[PDB]
C-alpha cells in the first residue's frame, strides 16, 4: 500500500527538474584504466571460483536530495525521465590497445555480452540475488548473497538487498526484484554471446513516462530521488588476447511535480 | 459456464504472485538449474536420453481465496512476468571454456525457449517428437505409443501439464486446438551461436481477457501457472555442454465474476 495519494499541486513552483551523470563501476584495475575491468580469468572450476574485486562490474547508484517542499503533506512525484549512455563513439578508437582483427588490419572492436539498465525511484532499488555458481567466493569489498546454497542458482528468497552502496553490488549476482519495487520503475536488457555487437541510440527527444496505471509516479520518501544504472558495453580484447569489460556513464534528466499525500 | 457480471467492492479484487523454479535436469546437488551434459550423434534407432539431460516444463497451482460456501469464480485479468537472474550469465570466470588463449570464458548461448501460461485449468499439451523411436527414460511422461506420424501431428498425444519436472520440453507444446481457459505465450530460437536476449521491467503487463472481455475463470479456486525458460548452452572447459535455465516470476491480478 504505502501512502494515500491525493491531488497534484499546480503552480509555476510545483515542478522541478534534476539531472546527473552516473559513472560506471567496471572494476578500475589501476588509476589509468578508469571505466575498464581487470582482465578476465577463465576455466576456474565451480569448486574453486574466487574472482578478484577489480574483475567484477558493479551496479551504479546515487541518491539525489530534492528541495524540502513541506517547509497536508507533499511529496515529489517523478513523472518523466530522459536517459542516455555517454561516450558511445569512443569505441571508434581502434588504433589503441586492441588486438588486430588480422594481419595489417585495424584493432578489434569492443563486442560481446552486454547489459544496459537504469532505474528511477523514491526508494533504493530492491534487488534479488541469483548466482551462476553458488560456491563462488566473492572478494572483500563486494556485497553478494549471504549463506548461498544450490537454490541460489535458481531462486533463493533470502537474497534480498537494497542497492544502497555504489561500486559494491556485482552485476553478475543481483537483478531487480519484480516482486517488490513498488516505488521504482526499472528497465534492463541483457544480450550475451562472444560476438554480440553493441547497439546504442542517442537522442534528446525521447522520454520515458514513470506514471503507473493510476497515473502515479515514484514518490520520493524523505525528499530523496534514487537513480541506478549498469551499462556494460562488451569486452575489450588486448593485443595479447586478454579481455576486459568496458563500461560507460549514463545521464538522467528527471521531471518531478508536487503531490499531496495522507 | 455462462459468464455474468463482474462483482465490485474492494474485496472483489485480489493479487497473487510466485517464483517458479526451472527444471533443467539437475545432474547433481550442486548443479541446480543445469542439465546433465549433452550426448550427441546417437542414431534415431537407438536414441535413449538420460532423465537428467532432459529439461521439463515447470508448473504450479496457486490457491485463491475461497468464494462459495449466486456462484462466483476468480477471473484472471492481467499478468506481469519476468525471467529471474539474467545477469548471472555475466560470470565468465567459472567453469566455461576460454574463447581463446588468454581470453575470458565463453558466454552461454545457443538454442533457447521461453514460455509461460496462466489459466484456470491445467495447461493442455500436444506431443510432437523429433524422432518417434526415442526411448524416453523412467520418470518422464512422453507420448504413448509413438508412430512415425508423431513426428508431425499425432492427435492421440494429448496431455495435461499435471506434474512438475516430468514433461520434457522437447516432447510437448501448448495445444492450440484446446486451452479455452488458458493464455499461453512462447518463443523458440534455435542455432549454435544464438545470443540470449532478455528484457526486464516492472512496467509491462499482459492482459488475459479474450475477445469478449473474459479472462481465465479459475475452477475450484485454483490458478495455474506454467513455464519453460531454457536460456542456452553452457560450454565447459572440456567442450561438454549443459542446458542452463532460470526461474520465472508471476504477478496475477484477479476479480470476482458471477457465473450460472
Amino acid at each position: 500500500g504505502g501512502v494515500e495519494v491525493l491531488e497534484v499541486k499546480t503552480g509555476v513552483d510545483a515542478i522541478t527538474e534534476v539531472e546527473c551523470f552516473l559513472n560506471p563501476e567496471m572494476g578500475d584495475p589501476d588509476e589509468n584504466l578508469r571505466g575498464f575491468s581487470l582482465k578476465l580469468s577463465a576455466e576456474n572450476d565451480f569448486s574453486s571460483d574466487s574472482p578478484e574485486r577489480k574483475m567484477l562490474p558493479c551496479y551504479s547508484t546515487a541518491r539525489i536530495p530534492l528541495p524540502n517542499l513541506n517547509e497536508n503533506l507533499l511529496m515529489w512525484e517523478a513523472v518523466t525521465v530522459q536517459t542516455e549512455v555517454i561516450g558511445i563513439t569512443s569505441m571508434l578508437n581502434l588504433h589503441a590497445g586492441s588486438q588486430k582483427v588480422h594481419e595489417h588490419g585495424g584493432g578489434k572492436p569492443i563486442q560481446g555480452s552486454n547489459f544496459h539498465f537504469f532505474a528511477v525511484g523514491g526508494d533504493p532499488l530492491e534487488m534479488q540475488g541469483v548466482l551462476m555458481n553458488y560456491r563462488t567466493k566473492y572478494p572483500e569489498g563486494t556485497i553478494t548473497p549471504k549463506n548461498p546454497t544450490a537454490q541460489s542458482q535458481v531462486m533463493n528468497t533470502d537474497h534480498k538487498a537494497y542497492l544502497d552502496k555504489n561500486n559494491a553490488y556485482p552485476v553478475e549476482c543481483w537483478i531487480p526484484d519484480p516482486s517488490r519495487n513498488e516505488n521504482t520503475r526499472y528497465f534492463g536488457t541483457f544480450t550475451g554471446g562472444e560476438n554480440v555487437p553493441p547497439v546504442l541510440h542517442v537522442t534528446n527527444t525521447a522520454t520515458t513516462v514513470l506514471l503507473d496505471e493510476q497515473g502515479v509516479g515514484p514518490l520520493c520518501k524523505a525528499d530523496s530521488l534514487y537513480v541506478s544504472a549498469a551499462d556494460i558495453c562488451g569486452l575489450f580484447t588486448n593485443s595479447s588476447g586478454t579481455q576486459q569489460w568496458r563500461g560507460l556513464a549514463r545521464y538522467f534528466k528527471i521531471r518531478l511535480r508536487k503531490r499531496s499525500v495522507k | 459456464v455462462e459468464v455474468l457480471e463482474v462483482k465490485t467492492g474492494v474485496d472483489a479484487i485480489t493479487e497473487v504472485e510466485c517464483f517458479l523454479n526451472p527444471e533443467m535436469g539437475d545432474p547433481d546437488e550442486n548443479l541446480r538449474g543445469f542439465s546433465l551434459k549433452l550426448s550427441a550423434e546417437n542414431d534415431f534407432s537407438s536414441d535413449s536420453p538420460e532423465r537428467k539431460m532432459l529439461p521439463c516444463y515447470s508448473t504450479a497451482r496457486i490457491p485463491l481465496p475461497n468464494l462459495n460456501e449466486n456462484l462466483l469464480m476468480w477471473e484472471a485479468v492481467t499478468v506481469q512476468t519476468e525471467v529471474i537472474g539474467i545477469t548471472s550469465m555475466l560470470n565468465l570466470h567459472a567453469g566455461s571454456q576460454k574463447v581463446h588463449e588468454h581470453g575470458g570464458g565463453k558466454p552461454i548461448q545457443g538454442s533457447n525457449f521461453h514460455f509461460f501460461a496462466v489459466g484456470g485449468d491445467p495447461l493442455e499439451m500436444q506431443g510432437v517428437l523429433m524422432n518417434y523411436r526415442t526411448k524416453y527414460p523412467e520418470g518422464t511422461i512422453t507420448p504413448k505409443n509413438p508412430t512415425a506420424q508423431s513426428q508431425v501431428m499425432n492427435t492421440d498425444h494429448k496431455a495435461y501439464l499435471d506434474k512438475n519436472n516430468a514433461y520434457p520440453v522437447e516432447c510437448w507444446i501448448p495445444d492450440p486446438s484446446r486451452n479455452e481457459n488458458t493464455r499461453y505465450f512462447g518463443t523458440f530460437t534455435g542455432g549454435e551461436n544464438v545470443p540470449p536476449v532478455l528484457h526486464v521491467t516492472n512496467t509491462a503487463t499482459t492482459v488475459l481477457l479474450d475477445e469478449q472481455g473474459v479472462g481465465p475463470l479459475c475452477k475450484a479456486d485454483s490458478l495455474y501457472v506454467s513455464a519453460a525458460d531454457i536460456c542456452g548452452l553452457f560450454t565447459n572447459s572440456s567442450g561438454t555442454q549443459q542446458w542452463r535455465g532460470l526461474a520465472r516470476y508471476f504477478k496475477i491480478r484477479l476479480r470476482k465474476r458471477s457465473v450460472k
Partner: single-chain antibody
Amino acid sequence: QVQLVESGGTLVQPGGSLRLSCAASGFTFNNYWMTWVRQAPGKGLEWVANIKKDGSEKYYVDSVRGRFTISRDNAKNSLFLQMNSLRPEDTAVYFCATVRSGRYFALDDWGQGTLVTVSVLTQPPSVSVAPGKTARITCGGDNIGSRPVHWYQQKPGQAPILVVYDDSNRPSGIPERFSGSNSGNTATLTISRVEAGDEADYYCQVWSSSTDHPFGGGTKVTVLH
C-alpha cells in the same frame, strides 16, 4: 546477551537414539542459520549439520546423513538434533552455534555443549611464543585461497570463540592483534602483542560446499609464562 544451552546428552547403547535440544535467547532466532558441531574427547571440531532460517534447507555431513535429523521451532527459539542408529564414532560433545558474521557460514555464538557417550586442512599441532612477541598459526590445503576461511579460538574446557571470519574480517569485541590472511595454499592467523589469555587451541574452518565445512586439527599456542 546471546545465550545458547544444549541439553539431552547421556550414555547411549550403540544403535540407540537420542534427541538433543538447544535453547536460544538474546537475539532474533529466525534471522540466522543454526549449526551443530561436535568434538570427540581430545580431538578437534567437526561440522555435523546446519539449517536455514526457516528450516526449509538442511545439510548434513556424510557420516551422519540418513541417521541425524536437524530441526528448529522458531516460535519457541529452539534447535534440535535427532540422532538415530548411534555408532561409537559419534561420541563427542555437541555444540549449538549461530551463523551471524559474513557470507560463508562462520560460527559466531556457541553454547556450553552437551556430552554424548556411545559405547583435509593441515595445521601444526603446537606453537610456542614469548609474551609480547608475535605468533603465526597456519592452515594448509589445496587452493585454500580460493575458499573462505574462518579462525576460532578455544580455551581448555570452554566453548569456541570466533576470532576471524571470511579470511580477514574480525568480529566486534576481538582485538586487532588477531589478524588473518589467505593466499595460495596456506591461510595464516597472526596473533600480535601476545598475552597470557591468548594461549589456547586455535582452529581453522573452510567453506567449500553445502555439506563440506572442513575444520583443521588445531594448534595449541602456549605463552611462555
